[PDB]
Design a protein around this ligand. Structure first.
Ligand SMILES: *[C@@H]1O[C@H](CO)[C@@H](O[C@@H]2O[C@H](CO)[C@@H](O)[C@H](O)[C@H]2NC(C)=O)[C@H](O)[C@H]1NC(C)=O
Length: 49
């Protein structure tokens, strides 16, 4: 069972604005935090979470 062993941990993740991997979300509303970014490795981070 390789489930949520790191469940209570909180991590800080740094990225650089590379267009095919991260992107600002195409919304007029000012988003906050992890809603501000989308892309390939953002989906990788979502799947790893
Ligand atoms: C941290 O994570 C653990 C497991 O990932 C959570 O565990 C349970 O906590 C309750 C309350 O003390 C226990 O009765 C259970 O036995 C625990 N589970 C296991 C498998 O031991 C814990 O709640 C988390 N801490 C938080 C959310 O503050």
């Amino acid at each position: 069972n390789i489930t949520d062993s790191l469940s209570n941990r909180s991590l800080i993740v740094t990225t650089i604005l590379e267009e095919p991997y991260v992107l600002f979300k195409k919304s007029d509303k000012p988003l906050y935090g992890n809603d501000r970014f989308e892309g390939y490795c953002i989906d990788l981070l979502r799947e790893l979470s």
